Design a binder for this molecule. Structure first.
Ligand SMILES: CCN(CC)c1ccc2c(c1)Oc1cc(N(CC)CC)ccc1C2c1ccccc1C(=O)OCCOCCn1cc(CO[C@@H]2O[C@@H](C)[C@@H](O)[C@@H](O)[C@@H]2O)nn1
Ligand SMILES: CCN(CC)c1ccc2c(c1)Oc1cc(N(CC)CC)ccc1C2c1ccccc1C(=O)OCCOCCn1cc(CO[C@@H]2O[C@@H](C)[C@@H](O)[C@@H](O)[C@@H]2O)nn1
Ligand SMILES: CCN(CC)c1ccc2c(c1)Oc1cc(N(CC)CC)ccc1C2c1ccccc1C(=O)OCCOCCn1cc(CO[C@@H]2O[C@@H](C)[C@@H](O)[C@@H](O)[C@@H]2O)nn1
Length: 259
């Protein structure tokens, strides 16, 4: 019943792009510092995930649009939207490096599996674990990636950790999740939409706890960015066809201009 969203951000402006799947069509809204507007992206799909990276100041966007079991990758490289080489379900994606490496996690029929890009083609990764819902975040430590995948069946969410030596279960404690991370520590915020309500758990480096965020919504996507050492987070909560943007900028959650 709800609409499904995915969101990505970049820069110290920042620019934001929000992709919304509604009745089988994905559309896009965009922020460049002074107001929202309708973006150029428009392609069919029932669920959506997104990641993006910068090479210098040039943004590259990848939108993963799922229908049935088929996911179609869409590519922004500064020159229109074009179909990617990637080959119902629900996806989560993350990327790192200037290469880039991509990893796309697909919840299909209760199992989550992984497809990876490393510059020379798509291949099936080692991640294979139960779940009805997936979200993902990652960070670099210099040049080594660390990945956390949040896998949900029922109301139970299991964190999976990749840290250079195989997957292991993390200590984090079908609902729908979204995740973001920042720093080298790192900090993590995970948001969960369950029975019409979105709540938040957070990692310091030292134990999980419940965050302050609590708003209605059957579907959540998030994005975040750093200005110096201050984190700025945007959470997009959807009920029916309405999406509200809540904003963390260091002092409580303010209502955003998103429409
Ligand atoms: C920093 C500047 N950038 C980055 C934007 C750049 C650099 C080099 C090229 C660039 C662009 O573009 C091309 C384009 C072509 N064409 C255009 C008609 C023919 C295909 C030819 C050479 C260059 C080349 C190129 C020139 C000389 C020698 C080699 C290449 C090359 O690697 O080649 C790059 C393309 O082919 C080989 C490597 N590659 C890159 C990709 C990108 O794939 C997409 O992006 C990935 C991240 C995934 O999402 C994937 O699923 C998706 O399809 N696929 N294959
Ligand atoms: C006091 C300031 N802090 C801040 C956390 C701190 C810093 C370093 C350590 C600290 C604590 O504790 C230990 C403890 C040990 N022991 C004795 C108790 C061995 C059993 C040994 C070395 C240090 C180390 C340590 C010492 C020297 C060199 C490295 C480390 C280290 O790797 O530190 C790594 C950071 O550990 C902090 C606590 N932590 C981190 C995690 C990682 O958790 C995973 O990853 C997270 C991102 C989440 O996804 C989480 O859900 C998931 O399970 N689990 N516990
Ligand atoms: C948080 C406290 N408030 C109340 C609105 C506030 C906020 C911003 C300013 C404020 C005061 O004062 C100034 C003053 C100056 N001057 C003149 C004296 C020079 C020193 C210059 C800038 C600011 C700005 C300013 C800073 C950054 C971006 C825009 C503005 C602005 O002028 O716009 C006012 C904010 O609302 C108008 C529209 N808007 C909103 C945003 C940020 O909003 C959020 O953040 C975005 C990233 C998106 O997520 C968006 O959907 C979400 O609503 N940026 N523009």
């Amino acid at each position: 019943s709800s609409v499904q969203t995915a969101a990505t951000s970049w820069g110290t402006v920042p620019s934001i792009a929000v992709y919304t799947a509604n009745n089988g069509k994905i559309t896009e809204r965009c922020w460049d510092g002074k107001g929202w507007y309708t973006g150029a992206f428009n392609e069919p799909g029932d669920n959506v995930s997104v990641t993006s990276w910068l090479v210098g100041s040039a943004i590259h966007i990848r939108v993963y649009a799922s229908t049935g079991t088929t996911t179609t990758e869409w590519c922004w490289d500064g020159n229109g939207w074009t179909k990617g080489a990637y080959t119902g379900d629900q996806t989560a994606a993350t990327s790192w490096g200037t290469v880039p490496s991509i990893a796309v996690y697909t919840a299909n029929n209760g199992k989550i599996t992984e497809r990876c890009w490393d510059g020379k083609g798509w291949y099936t990764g080692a991640f294979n674990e139960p779940g009805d819902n997936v979200s993902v975040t990652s960070w670099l430590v210099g040049s080594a990636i660390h990945i956390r995948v949040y896998a949900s069946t029922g109301t139970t969410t299991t964190e999976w950790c990749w840290d250079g030596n195989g997957w292991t279960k993390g200590a984090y404690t079908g609902d729908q999740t979204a995740a973001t991370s920042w720093g080298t520590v790192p900090s993590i915020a995970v948001y969960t939409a369950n029975n019409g309500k979105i709540t938040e758990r957070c990692w310091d480096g030292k134990g999980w706890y419940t965050g302050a965020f609590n708003e209605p919504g059957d579907n959540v996507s998030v994005t975040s960015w750093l200005v110096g050492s201050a984190i700025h987070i945007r959470v997009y909560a959807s009920t029916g066809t309405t999406t509200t943007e809540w904003c963390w900028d260091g002092n409580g959650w303010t209502k955003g201009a998103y429409t």
